[PDB]
From Swiss-Prot:
Keywords: Coiled coil, Cytoplasm, Initiation factor, Phosphoprotein, Protein biosynthesis, RNA-binding. The lineage of its organism: Eukaryota, Fungi, Dikarya, Ascomycota, Saccharomycotina. The chain holds residues 278 to 493 of 964 of the full protein. This is Eukaryotic translation initiation factor 3 subunit A. Belongs to the eIF-3 subunit A family. It comes from the Eukaryota. It comes from Saccharomyces cerevisiae (strain ATCC 204508 / S288c) (Baker's yeast).
């Protein structure tokens, strides 16, 4: 079966940390499932919502040889996939996007098209309560929380020079199950630092953070 081989591929790519190949293999499985006539409409909604959520919660494109080449080949990509393009390919594919739960579309709008650090918590607040009722949701909690805080941090890198950790972390503390403690928030920030999305200065005795250039 080509289905099981793709299924297996989505698992592999999920544990590898190559999320773009994960949602890609998902799409390759979905086309198959759509050809198939054992189609329940609910599997469609679950799979489509799963796929789209995978794309939303995908890490922002680091700009980096390429060791994904045989995987690109295996999956019939001809170039390195892009987060923005994956999301776009899903949005413009009505076979998928017509089955996507509207909570994920609301979510997409909030973090991709109308992001504001000064409004995110209030907007995400009850939405995440709804999303926490979804069965496809829990396993993307970690990468989704990671991408929004990343959004929060670069937006912060441009708003602040020197700011208290209290105001910074309170600002980066997302609602509902995307909540992280202060030490995790400081680590997530140090992570964004080493990925060169940000240049900082951290555990100053003054309990402050200093965003650089």
């Amino acid at each position: 079966t080509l289905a099981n081989y793709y299924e297996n591929l989505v698992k592999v790519f999920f544990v590898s940390g190559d999320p773009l190949l994960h949602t890609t293999a998902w799409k390759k499985f979905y086309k198959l499932y759509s050809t198939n006539p054992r189609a329940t409409e609910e599997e469609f909604k679950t799979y489509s919502s799963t796929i789209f959520l995978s794309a939303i919660s995908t890490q922002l494109d680091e700009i980096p040889y390429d060791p994904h080449l045989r995987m690109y080949r295996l999956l019939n990509l001809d170039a390195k996939p892009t987060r923005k393009e994956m999301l776009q390919s899903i949005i413009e594919d009505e076979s998928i996007y017509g089955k996507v739960d509207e909570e994920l579309k609301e979510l997409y709008d909030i973090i991709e098209v109308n992001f504001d650090v000064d409004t995110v918590k209030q907007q995400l607040e009850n939405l995440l309560v709804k999303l926490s009722s979804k069965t496809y949701f829990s396993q993307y909690i970690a990468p989704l929380r990671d991408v929004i805080m990343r959004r929060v941090f670069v937006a912060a890198s441009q708003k602040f020079t020197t700011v208290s950790q209290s105001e910074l972390y309170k600002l980066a503390t997302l609602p509902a199950p995307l909540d992280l403690s202060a030490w995790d928030i400081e680590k997530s920030l140090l992570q964004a630092a080493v990925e060169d999305y940000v240049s900082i200065t951290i555990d100053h005795e003054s309990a402050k953070v200093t965003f650089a250039k």
